[PDB]
Amino acid sequence: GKGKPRGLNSARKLRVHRRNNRWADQAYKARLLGTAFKSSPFGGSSHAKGIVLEKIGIESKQPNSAIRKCVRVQLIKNGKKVTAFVPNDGCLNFVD
Amino acid sequence: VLVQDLLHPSPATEAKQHKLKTLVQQPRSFFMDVKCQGCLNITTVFSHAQTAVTCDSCSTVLCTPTGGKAKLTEGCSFRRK
């Protein structure tokens, strides 16, 4: 019988079972645990300002070979330090 | 066999079926009239008897229970009722 209850009075079992099993969905789990609020460097925001600490070149992964030019930024809102890419040919010279 | 008379099975094939697997289940057991050799007194005995039945007149065992049908003792003649 498909392994789930079908009785007309089994709504509690069906409702609880779905509630237990949505925790296997990482999109649902991250939303209720508030992982973006607790763990994300931005704190759930789309953008964040910061202060440039140093300009650093990062080697690309194989099979590519290049120096990806990023910066070390300390976020103003929480003091966390992140690495941010500086796009467009020669835009690292715009960042001090 | 796509077309077949389920309401009127062949009585030959009907008799080979298990007693519960006929259209209407019916026991295959019966009752017998048992004549002991010593005297003549009708004693009704179940065919599948589980008891060592003795006739009233003389205390002689008429049948001994077995796994299935009861086994009538020697000199005892039965007639199905």
Binding site: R6, G7, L8 | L2, V3, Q4, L6, L7, L23, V24, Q25
Partner: protein, 129 residues
Amino acid sequence: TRTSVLADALNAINNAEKTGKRQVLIRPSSKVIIKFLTVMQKHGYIGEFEYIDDHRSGKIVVQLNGRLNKCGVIQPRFNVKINDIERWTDNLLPARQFGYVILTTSAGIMDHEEARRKHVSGKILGFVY
């Protein structure tokens, strides 16, 4: 164990119809089975059917005429309001011009088309097409 004799009856009919047999034996019988079969018989999906009395729940022999595509139960018997019949016919029936959803209403067991004529609704019971 045996929890729904109507599901067993309709499953046996479906298995016999898929194999091209023109008759099927149903055990046990019941009032709901007989009235479900009468609805199927009235619309021509089955032929004459026969009730066998064995001083028990009973048995039925149904004559099939090859017009039956599928008959089935809906477990559980959901409560169906008149406004909910449209949703059930959309999900269960192959088209809007044929097929029937069988309901048990306080006015009796009937197909969804008859239920609309007398403006009654009950619990869903099955389907046939």
